[PDB]
C-alpha cells in the first residue's frame, strides 16, 4: 500500500509536463483515484478524479487544460498538464478515495516560473 | 449470434424476426415473484456478523429490489446466525423515499461461519428468538442507529435468470467501493427520433423535437446512486443545473432528460411512493405565460388539503405544455409555475429537496 | 458546496480542551472527514463518517454534528498535536475542503 | 383466419422452427399460488353463498388445488362484503386432503345480487370483518360439524385463461347447469 | 413494442414489452417523394453549375439505380436535354462540398406514380449528369453534391417496408439518424446503421470487442446517438472520427490508437482482435514505428510467420478482407523487409 | 421436452415454456427410401410374381417415386435386368389395391449404396401411378408397401426414410398424424389433411382443406372421441380417410359419398356460394350427386332449398367453382343442365 | 438577411461577458453557426461552433471557459464568457456557415484591463 | 490541419495579376473558402469550394489549383481591391484560418 509519484519539476510558463504515480499494493484500476494540490503556503485543493469505471471528473480552473489517466499494464496513474500557467505552481499528491482519502502519495513539486 | 427474437403487431397479425438488442419494460412489474439468492448463507452471515463488530448498525436500501431481497433472506439468516451461537438479529422495515446514501460498506469476510445450510432456498425450519442486539435493515430506526452508521449500495448482481415459472436473482457482496447504479440491469437504446434510459425501477423516454427533450418518466423509487457515463447517451456540454431529474436522483447526466425553459426540479414532491413526469396540464387547471408572475420555489400541489382545485397558474419563461407530476395524492406543478390570483400560503407544498 | 472553517486560527496549551467547527452551505448526508498535516508533509485522515475513528491514531479525537454543522474535539491536547486540520465533504462534485485551522502553544 | 403462431427452438444445436398450429404446454409445478382469480362477482358470489346457506349446503369440498388457492384468495375480500350486507356468516378456508372426495350438492345461481359492496377483486382497500358464529366452511379438517352429505362439489366453470405481460389471470363463473 | 427472444448460451426465453434494435447489416422500399421533383432539382442543379452527386452510403445509389430510368423519362418529355448515369460505389465514399437546390416549382408535365409502367427509354444526350463511378475528370470532386436528401421517416416501428427520400432545406454535415440505433444492456453494447455493425464488450474497462463493415462513409456519427462522448480524444478512436466513427469510449482499445491508414480501400472488413490464419506476433520493444497497413501474405501467396508489436496488446488488431487478413498499424514484421510486401494506399 | 413461445392474435397475447406442438404441415423435409438397392430387388422380385405397377397412397409417394425413378433405373440396367420404372401423375380420388411389394431377402450385387448415366428404354415398364389403367389394371397393383420412420414430437430432422414394409396394413401411416385438442378447438391433421373442429352446444366440424383424397383409414390411435358414432354421420366418408369421431360430424348432414371428389384441391366450409340463397322447405328433393353453383355455360342458379339440413350450408370450395352438398337442390331450375359429380364413395 | 452583435463592452480580468447574435432573415435552429474573433492588428481566429443538431465544439484557447448556446423562442445565438484573460482582447462575429461562411454581423468589441 | 499562406504581403499596380497561394498541411477534399477583409469591416466571401465563384464578386477573381497547393488569382487589378485575403478549410474540426496576405497600392 505505497503510492509514489514523480515527474515534478521546473518548467517554462505555457509548457507541458506529466506526472505519475506508480502503485504497490493496490490495483489502480479497482479503486478510485484522486489529485490534490497544494499551494505554496496555501490551503489544499481539490484537482482531478477517475472513478473505477473510467469516468473522469475536473475542477473549474483546471478544466479543458489537464487530463487524468490510469494504465493497467503498468498499474500507475497519470495528470497530463498542458498550457501551464504560474498559478499552478504546487506540491500534487494522489490519493486513493473510498468515502475518505486514507492512502496518500509522498507529494511532489511542480514549479511554473519564466 | 445469441440474442435472436421476433416482434408482434397485434393490429396486423404479422411478425418480424432477426438478431439484435432487445430492452424490456420491466418497470411495472415490481414484483415480489422473484427469488432472491444472496452471496451464501454462511457467507452473508459472517459478512454481518464483521459488520456488528466494526460499528456498523444497520443498512440503507439502494432501491426496492434491495428492500425485497432483505424481507426475503431475513429469517433464514437468522435462523443461520442462532445455530452459529451469534447473538444478532435483522430487523426489516419499509422504504422511504428518497433512498438517501449512507457512507459505510459491508465487508467481506476471509471464512464464513462453518455451522448451517449450502443454499437459499434449501431450508428455513426453527425460527429465531429475539436478541438484544438488533442490526435494523431500513425503516423507522433512524435514533438507534443513524444514517452514518448505515451501509450502502453493498451488493453486486451476477446473473438475472429467467426461468419457465420463476426468475432468480444471484448477488455477491463487492469486494470495492463505488458509487454507480449497478449497470447488470440498465438499458438504454435510441433508434430514430426516440430514445430510452432504463433500469429496474426508471423508465426514461425522450423525443425529437426541434431538439431533443425529456417527454415523460415514470418512478417507481427514488434513488441516490449515479448513472454510469458508460450506459448514458450524449454525456457532453450539458451543465448539471440544466437536468429535469436533478443528477443526486440518478438522472442520467444526458442531453436527453432536458427541457426548454425549465431548470433542475431540485424541490420537487419526491416524497411519493411512486409518481410519473408529464408535460400537460393539471385536471381543471390552466397555465398563463406572462412575465408578471413570482419567482420559481417549491413544488405546490394544485387541490388544496380541502379538496378544492386551483383554476389560476402562471410561470415567467416556461414554455407549453406545463411540467407536472402525477402521484396517488394528486398532480403538482413544476417548481417554476405559481398561483396567478390566490396567495401560495393556501396550498400544500414540498418539505424535501435533492 | 462551499465548506466553513472556524475558527481561522487557535491556541491552547497541553492538556485542554480544543474544538474546531466546519459548515457546510447545504445537506452532505454524512460524508465529511478530518485530515491534519504537520508542515513539510502529506496529510492524514484522523476522522471519517462524522464520527467513525480509523486504525492507529489516538483516541482523543472526536467528532459530531448538530444541523449541517460539524465540530472536532481534542480531549487532553498534547505536544504532538499542534498541526492544520481540514474538513472535506466527499457527497458532491467537486470534492471541497475547508480553509485549515492550525493549533499553536501558548 | 390463422391466430395462433409459434416457434420452437433447439438449445443445443440454435435452430429455431416456426409456424401455425395447436400448442399445448405443460403447467404442472408452476406457481399458481400468485395468479389473479376473478370468481363471477363480490356481489354474485356473497348472495350465491347466503343463498346456499339457507339451502342447508354448509360447505364446499373443493374440486382442484387450484379452487382451494381460489377460495384462499377470496375469503377476507367476501367476509368483507358479507358483512357491509348485514348478513352473519363468514367463510372458513382449510387445508386439503387427497383424494378430494365428490359432493352431491350444487351452488346456485340467485336471481339477484347483494344491493351492497364493490364490483371487482383485489380492491377497495377493506377492513378484516368480525367473526361470527355461523360459519360456511371450505374443505379442511372439519368433516365432522357438517359431513360430506351437505357439500357442494363442482360449482365453478373457467371463462377466460389469459396470460398478461406481467401476471397471469383465471376468470371464473358460477355454473348454470349440473 | 410487444415481442419474445431466447439467449443460447444462458437457455432461457421471455416475452414482454419494449424496445428493440435489430442487425439491417432488399427488406426495405428506398425511392424519393416525387420524380418531378427531382427531376426539377437535378435541373436547377445542372443549370447552375453542379454536374454530379457523390453517394454517402450503398442505400443512395441503389435508390438512384432504381430511379434513374423514370427519371430520364421525365426530363426528356419536358424538353430537357440531360442524362443521368449511375456507376458503381469505390469505397471510401469521399465527401462533397456542394448541395442539392429545393425547387420552388415542379415539372409542369410528367407523373408522380413510383413506378414508370411506360418502359419508353430517351436518347442518350451529349449532356451527362453523372453519379458516383469512375468520372472524376468529366465532373471533379469540387462541383459534386453530397448529403442532399433527408430519410423522412423515423421512429421504433419495424412494420413498414416503405421508406421515402427527401431534398432537404438546410445544410448538414452528420449521418441521419433515421436509420441508426445504438443500444446498450448489461455487459454488451452496439452502434449500428444500415452498414455498420459496431460492437463493444465489458471487460476490466469498457472497449471494442468487434466490428463488421460492409461501406465506407465520411459523414460524422451524430452525438445524440452515441454513449459516452466525453472525456475521449480523436486521436484514440480505432475507427477514425473521419470514416463515421462514433466518438465514444466503446470505439477504442488499450495500447492502440486512431487506424488512419488502415485498408479502407476494400470493399468489406471484419475487425478482430486475433491472429491470421498460421501466425505468430510477439512483444519487442525493439519493433518499428507505425505505419501502412500490411497483409500477413506476400504478392506471391507466402505467408509471413514473424511479427513484432512495440507496446501493443494481445490479441493483436487484424483486418479481415475478402484477399487477405491484414494487420493494425503498430505490428510489423521481425524479419522480412516491408519495401516487398503490399500496403493500403489510402489514408484517412 | 420441447421448449417454444407463441403468439394469440385474438387474444392479443403472448407466452413460452415446454410442451407439445402441432404444426400446420400441409420442401422442409427429405423423403427418401431407405436403400435404392434393396428396393430395386423388390420392384424386379414384384415383376417376377406377376405386379405390373405401383398406385400411390398420398402425394408424398409419387413425389419420392420422381425423384428416385432415374437412379433406380439405373440399378435395374446395371444388372441387366429388362425392365423401366415409368412415373405418372396422380388424379383424385387415389384407389387402393389389393397387392403389396415384397420384402427382397438379399439386394442386387451391382450398384451404389448412396443417394449417373442416363438409362434408356426397354420393352417391360413397371407403371408407377397415372393414366396406364389399360395396360396395368388396379387388380394387378401394389397399394400402402413403404414405412415411414418415425420422429415424435420432434421437428430438427431435415430428413426422412422410408422402407417396405414386412406385414400387411389398411391404415394411413401414424408417423405423420397429429391430433390435439385444447380448450374449444381441435384439429386431425396429416401430409394432406387438415381437418378442423369446434365447440358450440356439441362438438362438429368447422372447416377443412383437403390437397389430396386418399383411401387408407385413419387410426383409431390418433383420434378423439371414437365410441359411440355411426359411420353413417361422418361427414368426410371412412373410406376417403375420413377419422372416425364426434368432431367428424355436422348435425342435419349425413355422410357425403359423392360430392366432388375429382377434385385437385378442395376446401369444405359452412357457408353459402357467392350470390346464392338456400332455404329450408319441406318440398326439396331427397338427396343426390352435388351440383355445381354455376352451369357448363356460367350462369348462377340463385335459388336452392333443402329438406331438413341446416345453416349456413355445406359447400366444397373448387377451383373451378362452388359447389353444395348432397342435401341442396335447386329450387326451381331442373337439374338435367347442372355440373354433378360422376364419382363416389 | 441581418444579424448583429450585443453585449461587447469593458470588462476587468477574471469578470464575465454574455454576448448576443440577433438573427433576422434565418432561424438559427436549421443552421451551423460559428464564433470568429480578431485580436488588434492580428488574424482572424476560430472560438466555437453549434451544428443544427446542438452539437458544439470549442477551440483548445477557449476550452473549458467559453460556452456556445441559443435560444429558439428569441432566435438569438448567445456566447457566454468566464474567467477571461488579457489575451481574450478582440472583435467577435457571428457568422452562419453552409460549407462557407457567406452571412457576417457587424462584429462586437471586448475589451480586458484593469 | 495548418494553413499556410505566402506571400505575407504583396504590392502591385493597376492592371497586373496577382496570385495569393494558400497551403494545408494535411487533405482537404475540397473544403477551401478565400475572404477579403478590408479595415474597420467584415469580412467578405469571395471563392469557396476551391474555385466555385460566390453571387455579386466580379469576374476578375478566380481560385483552383493541382495537388496539395491552392492558388487565388486577381485578373484586373482595380484600386477599390486592395485589402487582406484569407484561406479557411471547413473540413475539420478545428476550423483553421491563414495568417493573410495584405495587398497595398504600388
Chains 1, 7 share one sequence.
Not at chain 1, 509536463?17 to 483515484?33: D, E, H, P, Q, W
Not at chain 2, 419494460?25 to 415480489?32: G, L, P, Y
Request: charge should be neutral; include cysteine.
Amino acid at each position: 500500500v505505497q503510492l509514489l509519484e514523480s515527474g515534478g519539476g521546473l518548467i517554462q510558463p505555457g509548457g507541458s509536463l506529466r506526472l505519475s504515480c506508480a502503485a504497490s499494493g493496490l490495483t489502480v484500476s479497482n479503486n478510485y483515484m484522486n489529485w490534490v494540490r497544494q499551494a505554496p503556503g496555501k490551503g489544499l485543493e481539490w484537482v482531478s478524479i477517475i472513478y473505477s469505471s473510467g469516468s473522469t471528473y475536473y475542477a473549474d480552473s483546471v478544466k479543458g487544460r489537464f487530463t487524468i489517466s490510469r494504465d493497467t499494464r503498468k498499474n500507475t496513474l497519470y495528470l497530463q498538464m498542458h498550457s501551464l500557467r504560474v498559478e499552478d505552481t504546487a506540491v500534487y499528491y494522489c490519493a486513493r478515495e473510498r468515502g475518505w482519502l486514507d492512502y496518500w502519495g509522498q507529494g511532489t513539486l511542480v514549479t511554473v516560473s519564466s | 449470434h445469441h440474442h435472436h427474437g421476433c416482434s408482434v403487431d397485434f393490429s396486423k397479425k404479422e411478425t418480424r424476426c432477426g438478431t439484435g438488442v432487445f430492452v424490456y419494460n420491466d418497470v411495472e412489474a415490481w414484483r415480489d415473484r422473484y427469488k432472491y439468492h444472496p452471496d451464501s448463507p454462511r457467507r452473508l452471515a459472517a459478512a454481518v456478523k464483521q459488520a456488528w463488530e466494526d460499528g456498523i448498525c444497520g443498512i440503507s436500501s439502494v432501491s426496492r429490489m434491495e428492500n425485497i431481497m432483505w424481507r426475503s433472506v431475513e429469517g433464514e439468516l437468522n435462523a443461520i446466525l442462532e445455530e452459529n451461537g451469534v447473538q444478532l438479529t435483522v430487523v426489516v422495515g419499509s422504504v422511504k423515499n428518497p433512498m438517501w446514501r449512507g457512507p459505510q460498506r459491508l465487508p467481506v469476510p476471509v471464512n464464513e461461519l462453518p455451522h448451517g445450510w449450502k443454499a437459499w432456498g434449501k431450508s428455513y425450519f426453527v425460527r429465531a428468538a429475539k436478541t438484544n442486539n438488533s442490526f435494523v435493515v431500513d425503516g423507522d430506526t433512524l435514533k438507534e442507529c443513524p444514517l452514518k452508521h448505515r451501509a450502502w449500495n453493498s451488493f453486486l448482481v451476477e446473473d438475472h435468470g429467467f426461468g419457465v415459472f420463476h426468475t432468480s436473482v444471484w448477488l455477491k457482496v463487492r469486494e470495492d467501493y463505488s458509487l454507480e447504479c449497478d449497470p447488470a440491469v440498465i438499458g438504454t437504446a435510441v433508434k430514430g427520433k426516440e430514445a430510452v434510459h432504463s433500469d429496474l425501477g426508471y423508465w426514461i423516454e425522450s423525443e425529437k423535437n426541434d431538439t431533443w427533450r425529456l417527454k415523460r418518466a415514470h418512478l417507481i423509487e427514488m434513488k441516490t446512486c449515479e448513472w454510469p457515463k458508460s450506459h448514458t447517451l450524449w454525456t457532453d456540454g450539458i451543465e448539471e443545473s440544466d437536468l429535469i431529474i436533478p443528477k443526486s436522483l440518478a438522472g442520467p447526466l444526458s442531453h436527453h432528460n432536458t427541457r426548454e425553459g425549465y431548470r433542475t426540479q431540485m424541490k420537487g414532491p419526491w416524497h411519493s411512493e411512486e409518481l410519473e413526469i408529464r408535460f400537460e396540464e393539471c385536471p381543471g387547471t390552466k397555465v398563463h405565460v406572462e412575465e408578471t408572475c413570482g419567482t420559481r420555489g417549491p413544488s405546490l400541489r394544485s387541490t388544496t388539503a380541502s379538496g378544492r382545485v386551483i383554476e389560476e397558474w402562471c410561470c415567467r419563461e416556461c414554455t407549453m405544455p406545463p411540467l407536472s407530476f402525477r402521484a396517488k395524492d394528486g398532480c403538482w406543478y413544476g417548481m417554476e409555475i405559481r398561483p396567478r390570483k390566490e396567495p401560495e400560503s393556501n396550498l400544500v407544498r414540498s418539505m424535501v429537496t435533492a | 458546496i462551499w465548506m466553513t472553517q472556524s475558527p481561522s486560527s487557535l491556541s491552547a496549551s497541553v492538556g485542554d480542551r480544543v474544538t474546531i467547527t466546519c459548515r457546510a452551505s447545504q445537506s452532505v448526508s454524512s460524508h465529511l472527514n478530518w485530515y491534519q498535516q504537520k508542515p513539510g508533509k502529506a496529510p492524514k485522515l484522523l476522522i471519517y463518517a462524522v464520527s467513525s475513528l480509523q486504525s492507529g491514531v489516538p483516541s482523543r479525537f472526536s467528532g459530531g454534528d448538530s444541523g449541517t454543522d460539524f465540530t472536532l474535539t481534542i480531549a487532553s491536547l498534547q505536544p504532538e498535536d499542534f498541526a492544520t486540520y481540514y474538513c472535506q465533504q466527499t457527497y458532491t462534485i467537486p470534492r471541497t475542503f475547508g480553509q485549515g485551522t492550525k493549533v499553536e502553544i501558548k | 383466419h390463422h391466430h395462433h403462431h409459434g416457434c420452437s427452438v433447439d438449445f443445443s444445436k440454435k435452430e429455431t422452427r416456426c409456424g401455425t398450429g395447436v400448442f399445448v404446454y405443460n403447467d404442472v409445478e408452476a406457481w399458481r399460488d400468485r395468479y389473479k382469480y376473478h370468481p363471477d362477482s363480490p356481489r354474485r358470489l356473497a348472495a350465491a353463498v347466503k343463498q346456499a346457506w339457507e339451502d342447508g349446503i354448509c360447505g364446499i369440498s373443493s374440486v382442484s388445488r387450484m379452487e382451494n388457492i381460489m377460495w384462499r384468495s377470496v375469503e377476507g375480500e367476501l367476509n368483507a362484503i358479507l358483512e357491509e350486507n348485514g348478513v352473519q356468516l363468514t367463510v372458513v378456508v382449510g387445508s386439503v386432503k387427497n383424494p378430494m372426495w365428490r359432493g352431491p350438492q350444487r351452488l346456485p345461481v340467485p336471481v339477484n345480487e347483494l344491493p351492497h359492496g364493490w364490483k371487482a377483486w383485489g380492491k377497495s382497500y377493506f377492513v378484516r370483518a368480525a367473526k361470527t358464529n355461523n360459519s360456511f366452511v371450505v374443505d379442511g379438517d372439519t368433516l365432522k360439524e357438517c359431513p360430506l352429505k351437505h357439500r357442494a362439489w363442482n360449482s365453478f366453470l373457467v371463462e377466460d385463461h389469459g396470460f398478461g405481460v406481467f401476471h397471469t389471470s383465471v376468470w371464473l363463473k358460477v355454473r348454470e347447469d349440473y
